[PDB]
Design a protein around this ligand. Structure first.
Ligand SMILES: [Ca+2]
Ligand SMILES: [Ca+2]
Ligand SMILES: [Ca+2]
Ligand SMILES: [Ca+2]
Ligand SMILES: [Zn+2]
Length: 316
């Protein structure tokens, strides 16, 4: 909408208070005009029609329980935008400040969230498996990262290239969570998953096997479920990324860590420069080695550590 930029206040899914950029014209809309061509958040009203209605509020205060998923989808999209801009010099998902659209209250008791090719979509969860999914900063940045991928590598969402797609979203969702400095960790979805159980999550990058995911190529899922294991085989790549950053020994292979900033630089360069729609794990290793080479030199510790991390998870 046309209007004036304003700033409201509300409470997120986890009961945390935060300011949000809005736009005023009769109502206050969840429309942040300060980031690129804007960040717009919509009410799907428990339906699956998209995007729904642009979120409108009478007083610019967002403290109703119904407001909570909208507050977080809107706020965390801005944080993710800031991450990509300040860290990678990237302006929104297309690199040209494309408007970012999200819808919340998608369907009834929907235990998921996704990037659909045009926008982000968040369920509220059924209250047992999940609370509203936009409540997780890693979840929001994971979905938004699918958009980055769509516009760069274009990784097909199937088999090894789909597993890499997933891993890329997990890696950058985590890097955004650390950038925000909000109880950061190497788990995925811990803030929104199973409100009745503390300390679990959907996926672990530091130890994927904790939740049944492979941490070595020899243990890869070879069947057809989950698009050929895109959220399962992502474990092998998530583990490699974790090792590159934090180091460690894994299957008797030692890795010297080079930190989160360099992991981010190396994988962003890989994603934007070398990966293709049909890249497999072997090609991701080559892409990451080439990227580390471009950035730090071929005899660098950074290049050595990438090779070691990929060796550790059995990817040559
Ligand atoms: Ca209000
Ligand atoms: Ca966390
Ligand atoms: Ca996390
Ligand atoms: Ca839990
Ligand atoms: Zn995903």
């Amino acid at each position: 909408i046309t209007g004036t930029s304003t700033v409201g206040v509300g409470r997120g899914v986890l009961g945390d208070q935060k300011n949000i950029n809005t736009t005023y014209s009769t109502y206050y809309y969840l429309q942040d005009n300060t980031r690129g061509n804007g960040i717009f958040t919509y009410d799907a009203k428990y339906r699956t029609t998209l995007p729904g209605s642009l979120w409108a509020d009478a007083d610019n205060q967002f403290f109703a329980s119904y407001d909570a998923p909208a507050v977080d989808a809107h706020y965390y999209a801005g944080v993710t935008y800031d991450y990509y801009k300040n860290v990678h010099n990237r302006l929104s998902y297309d690199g040209n400040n494309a408007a970012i659209r999200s819808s919340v209250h998608y369907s009834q008791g929907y235990n998921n969230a996704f990037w659909n090719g045009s926008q982000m979509v968040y369920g509220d969860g059924d209250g047992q498996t999940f609370i509203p999914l936009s409540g997780g900063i890693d979840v929001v940045a994971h979905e938004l990262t699918h958009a980055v991928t769509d516009y760069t590598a274009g990784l097909i969402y199937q088999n090894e290239s789909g597993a890499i797609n997933e891993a890329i979203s997990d890696i950058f969702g985590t890097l955004v969570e650390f950038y925000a400095n909000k109880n950061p960790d190497w788990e995925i979805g811990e803030d929104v998953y199973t409100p009745g159980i503390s300390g679990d999550s959907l996926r672990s990058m530091s130890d994927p096997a904790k939740y049944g995911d492979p941490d070595h190529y020899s243990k890869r899922y070879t069947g057809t479920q989950d698009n050929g294991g895109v959220h399962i085989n992502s474990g092998i790549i998530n583990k490699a990324a974790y090792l590159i950053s934090q180091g460690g020994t894994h299957y008797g292979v030692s890795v010297v860590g080079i930190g989160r900033d360099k992991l981010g630089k190396i994988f962003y360069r890989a994603l934007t420069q070398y990966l293709t729609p049909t890249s497999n794990f072997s090609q991701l290793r080559a892409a990451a080695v080439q990227s580390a080479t471009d950035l730090y030199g071929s005899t660098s510790q950074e290049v050595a550590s990438v090779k070691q991390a990929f060796d550790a998870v059995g990817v040559k």
